[PDB]
Structure 1
């Protein structure tokens, strides 16, 4: 139920995602998830709903349904705050909204720095994203300070390719290794090489969009759908489980942390019931064979950023 991180802490293998969870619904969603047994919530300042996630955590802490030490709360530094001097302030904003005094894990959300400002996606006159001249290593140094200051227990990365990971690992005077690399992973984007790399380095991998993000912004024509894949539905039927339950279990048996999103009480409940069954190695190998290198999150607007992560094979 929990994986051991390189800082000695233990991360729940199941977490609740909150991207696209509306402010008006996410408080009840998180209260329900905690009641059901979730102990890990995935957040980000860019999701514009951390205050409302925080209301729910505060209510369950007050009710004594959980202790603070039993929860594992994750957030992420957005791209407009990569400058050394903006990092602490961005973390503290998130702490204020979540109404906590430390985060369990704080991730660099994307490797690409953008120009600082109010816009999450700063554009120039020709409509292009304006990049920061910051690099990944100076940002890492700023994240390490947060650990020394007691604001976060662990720090990590998200959407980093193996060369960008290696860059941090070979950083002169590296004080804290990345604990976690959070990446997109599901049967259409299986990530076998990047997962084996990170895992050989003792970095825990968290799979996001495990159900294929059916509620993502654009349903772009003849779009692949994991929940509706007849081959995956067969494997669920054989196990008497739903295709969502098979999609959540799959990464767990690869020793990945998985963070399905839902604001629906019965689905939040359904997605928890994945600890009592096992997919065979045959099932696993079959699910791995469906890889089509399909990404939900390709960050196409940043394809010419100096630190765009997806030009490299893995």
Structure 2
């Protein structure tokens, strides 16, 4: 249960450390602790700013012989201001430099949304996306060896299919919000039919993000399953995703919960309990408001998510 296989043949560890919202000093400690506890998968993103810090933790892990580089699966993400084809490999090079790596295992287009290089998400910065042109540049970084796999994040079934249709190198991953409160069944089936792996971000419902209002680990179905199996709600939530065949990116800074989030491998949710997940109310928590706008290509949330909301 410990790995899934991407359409490139490479194995992605089923659990990775999320690092969204990890401040100065804290993220390196979490990455260090997660890897010694046994994590082999670290999910990063340039837009979080903390890649230099992550790189220093990885450098310490390598030097202490905790792991070798080829033991680790490192992901980073191309931010919305580097979609232009000429900017794509430069952005990757900057993420590589900050992380002190020669290659990423996975490079993702962060959002199907573009702004002018070096500007912020404001309506006077909006450029109409050209995913095919951007993907072409992602493909060259893959061909050059800088990214062992390339993929996307926050892509609907439609948009993922529109990219598969034009692509030479298939996206290896679609990383999306996915948890018992937002189970992504449509996208799940579509990935299965296309060979795209689905990585679950916010696999716990991001309890610690104020503006999302996530109380997923509080659904009675999860609590009930948690005590009949003798596991935390988190473990049950994570295990649910793994049993759906998805990798999960639990984010945490507490050492004990980091270890608990890895203990989702050698037990199962029985069939009769798993059926109960169809009873959980479904609501998308990361709605994408910041790119829904009268001047954006997505004027409604439906246009961003193509109905899956």
Q: Deviations along 1:57-79, whole A, 9 cap, x unmatched?
A: 11111111111111000011000
Q: Deviations along 1:122-144, whole A, 9 cap, x unmatched?
A: x2xxxx36311341111100100
Which residue number in structure 2 is paired with residue 199 of structure 1? 192
Which residue number in structure 2 is paired with residue 135 of structure 1? 130
Which residue number in structure 2 is paired with residue 298 of structure 1? 287
Q: Does 1:249 align with 2:250?
A: no
TM-score (norm 1): 0.92
Alpha-carbon distance in 1 for matches of 2:105, 2:22: 21
Which residue number in structure 2 is paired with residue 108 of structure 1? 109
- Cα deviation, residue 241, structure 1: 0.6
Which ranges in structure 1 are unaligned for 5 or more consecutive residues?
none
Q: Is the 8 A contact 1:13 1:257 kept in 2?
A: yes
Q: Is the 8 A contact 2:158 2:306 kept in 1?
A: no
Alpha-carbon distance in 2 for matches of 1:62, 1:118: 37
Of the three residues 207, 211, 231, the one matched with 1:214 is 207
Which residue number in structure 2 is paired with residue 68 of structure 1? 69
Q: Deviations along 1:71-123, whole A, 9 cap, x unmatched?
A: 0000110001100111011111110111100000000000111122143x2x2
- Using a 3 Å threshold, how does the CA distance of structure 1 residues 231 and 170 change in structure 2: closer, same or farther? closer
- Using a 3 Å threshold, how does the CA distance of structure 1 residues 224 and 40 change in structure 2: closer, same or farther? closer
Alpha-carbon distance in 2 for matches of 1:183, 1:4: 18
Which residue number in structure 2 is paired with residue 180 of structure 1? 173
Secondary structure of 2:218's aligned partner: coil
Q: Which runs of at least 4 in structure 1 moved beyond 4 Å after TM superposition?
A: none
- Cα deviation, residue 224, structure 1: 4.9
Which residue number in structure 2 is paired with residue 24 of structure 1? 25
Which ranges in structure 2 are unaligned for 5 or more consecutive residues?
none
Q: Does 1:10 align with 2:11?
A: yes
Which residue number in structure 2 is paired with residue 281 of structure 1? 271
Alpha-carbon distance in 1 for matches of 2:82, 2:148: 20
Q: Does 1:168 align with 2:169?
A: no
Q: Is the 8 A contact 1:144 1:155 kept in 2?
A: yes
Q: Does 1:229 align with 2:222?
A: no
Alpha-carbon distance in 1 for matches of 2:211, 2:149: 34
Q: Is the 8 A contact 1:45 1:75 kept in 2?
A: yes
Alpha-carbon distance in 1 for matches of 2:91, 2:279: 41
RMSD of aligned alpha carbons: 1.5
Secondary structure of 1:18's aligned partner: coil
Which has more helix, going by share of residues? Answer: 2
Q: Does 1:156 align with 2:151?
A: yes
Q: Does 1:258 align with 2:248?
A: yes
Q: Is the 8 A contact 1:77 1:106 kept in 2?
A: yes
- Using a 3 Å threshold, how does the CA distance of structure 1 residues 218 and 93 change in structure 2: closer, same or farther? same
Q: Is the 8 A contact 2:207 2:214 kept in 1?
A: no
- Cα deviation, residue 295, structure 1: 1.7
Alpha-carbon distance in 2 for matches of 1:71, 1:300: 34
- Using a 3 Å threshold, how does the CA distance of structure 1 residues 36 and 224 change in structure 2: closer, same or farther? closer
